[PDB]
């Protein structure tokens, strides 16, 4: 099974470095980790407003790190501005969920958001995410066995960022060329890594789909939050990305 070409190694260096430079708290994320108090985020009597405001206040730096990732990718930078905006709005929730899911800790059963905040399945659920909370936590639980490293995470983010099917894109064929390069590097790296899971590549492709479902859901649960909270209550960068 074929391993990376020199061009693909160079590409893998680029994405991996982009990812490491923009991953909150880096190696230290378990040390800088504050567990959100347990009284914050219990089930109402719909949306717990206290946990909602904590989540509201960290979504903005998390969206910004995704933007920083895309900007460190040379292929991304050659896209016109509106394509970049479309591509970022499309993959922001996907990449943030991946980044939270690979920080699932089975001993405490928490995800770490923003390199700093450990939340439980119940807190993220009752703070507004609803069933999408279960989706991200289930993903984290199942990714533990895939033992993804920084490079595999980086490549997954690049594959999601370079999605030519988002509505409105001008350079659809250009974007699919970029995605095809990442997918090839990603597979050849997987071949080289020799994970001890059968059909790793087909299973990873299903994870990509799991993430694209989390990303497509955030519309059904953008409205689930605007049932209670006026639009003023969300930070502006969140409103832009999610509508």
């Amino acid at each position: 099974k074929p391993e990376p070409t020199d061009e693909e190694w160079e590409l893998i260096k680029t994405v991996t470095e982009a990812h490491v430079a923009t991953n909150a708290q880096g190696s230290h994320w378990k040390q800088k980790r504050k567990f959100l108090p347990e009284d914050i985020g219990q089930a109402p009597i719909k949306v717990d407003l206290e946990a909602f405001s904590h989540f509201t206040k960290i979504i903005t730096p998390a969206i910004t790190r995704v933007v920083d990732f895309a900007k460190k990718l040379p292929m991304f930078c050659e896209l016109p501005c509106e394509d970049q905006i479309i591509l970022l709005k499309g993959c922001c929730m996907e990449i943030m969920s991946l980044r939270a899911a690979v920080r699932y800790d089975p001993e405490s059963e928490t995800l770490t958001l923003n390199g700093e905040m450990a939340v439980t399945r119940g807190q993220l659920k009752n703070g507004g995410l609803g069933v999408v909370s279960d989706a991200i936590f289930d993903l984290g639980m199942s990714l533990s066995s895939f033992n993804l490293d920084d490079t595999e995470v980086a490549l997954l983010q690049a594959v999601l960022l370079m999605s030519s099917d988002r509505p409105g894109l001008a350079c659809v064929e250009r974007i699919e060329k970029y995605q095809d390069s990442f997918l090839l590097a990603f597979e050849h790296y997987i071949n080289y890594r020799k994970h001890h899971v059968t059909h790793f590549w087909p299973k990873l492709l299903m994870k990509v789909t799991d993430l694209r479902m989390i990303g497509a859901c955030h519309a059904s649960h953008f409205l689930h939050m605007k049932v209670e909270c006026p639009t003023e209550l969300f930070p502006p960068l969140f409103l832009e990305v999610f509508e």
Binding site: T64, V67, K71, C81, Q84, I85, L88, K89, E240
Partner: peptide, 10 residues
């Protein structure tokens, strides 16, 4: 309409 996200993309 994406004033802030446009700015962040410089």
């Amino acid at each position: 309409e994406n004033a802030l996200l446009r700015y962040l993309l410089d």
